[PDB]
Design an enzyme around this catalytic site. Structure first.
Site, short mmCIF file in Angstrom:
data_model
loop_
_atom_site.label_atom_id
_atom_site.label_comp_id
_atom_site.label_asym_id
_atom_site.label_seq_id
_atom_site.Cartn_x
_atom_site.Cartn_y
_atom_site.Cartn_z
CG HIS A 137 -0.18 0.37 2.56
ND1 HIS A 137 0.44 -0.59 3.29
CD2 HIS A 137 0.17 1.56 3.15
CE1 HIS A 137 1.07 -0.03 4.34
NE2 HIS A 137 0.90 1.29 4.25
CG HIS B 159 7.05 4.98 1.01
ND1 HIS B 159 6.83 6.12 1.75
CD2 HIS B 159 7.05 3.95 1.91
CE1 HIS B 159 6.78 5.80 3.07
NE2 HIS B 159 6.86 4.46 3.14
#
Ligand code: CL
EC number: 4.6.1.-
Length: 187
Positions: A42, A130
């Protein structure tokens, strides 16, 4: 009752992505053996905040109303970076977003509106979006930055099909509150 609540963009792992990780992770483990592969992937859109139980379902409603109007998009995540959590009790190996960062900022602006609607803390002031790939206990930056990082980047730069990381296509937004999950499609 207070429930830890976090909003994020799932990443639906291509089979190529999992093969990349199968090469990256053992390489990193030669530096830090105790690294753990992520099970699911995620990109965060929020801090971890606390909501009173009563407000979870209204929060999810409000989130769904904004998210489901926001369009799917593509991003690039091919730059390896080392992250810690704020307490430095966890270290992460991740892929930082380059192209597509603008769209993530717009998504965060909408999440942050919902946060304010519920008196909750808005997102980090200087975000680096990220995808975390692996993590360990403690602060392992010294071992992972430097030569290891450069080697991991060369594995990424040599990876085929490079399109897997050049053009990563967002699908959905998710919220985890306590033990509960809520998902919603992007338009
Ligand atoms: Cl170790």
């Amino acid at each position: 009752g207070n429930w830890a609540t976090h909003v994020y963009v799932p990443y639906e792992a291509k089979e190529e992505f999992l093969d990349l990780l199968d090469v990256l992770l053992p390489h990193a483990q030669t530096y830090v053996p105790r690294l753990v592969r992520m099970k699911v992937f995620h990109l965060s859109l929020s801090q971890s905040v606390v909501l009173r139980h009563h407000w979870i379902l209204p929060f999810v409603q409000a989130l769904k109303a904004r998210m489901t109007s926001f369009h799917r998009f593509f991003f690039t995540a091919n730059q390896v970076k080392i992250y810690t959590n704020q307490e430095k009790t966890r270290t992460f190996i991740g892929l930082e977003v380059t192209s597509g960062h603008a769209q993530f900022l717009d998504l965060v602006s909408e999440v942050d509106r919902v946060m304010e609607e519920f008196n909750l803390t808005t997102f980090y002031q200087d975000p680096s979006f990220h995808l975390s790939l692996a993590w360990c206990v403690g602060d392992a930056r010294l071992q992972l930055e430097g030569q290891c990082l450069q080697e991991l980047q060369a594995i990424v730069d040599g990876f085929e099909d490079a399109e897997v990381l050049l053009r990563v296509h967002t699908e959905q937004v998710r919220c985890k509150s306590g033990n509960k999950f809520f998902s919603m499609p992007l338009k």
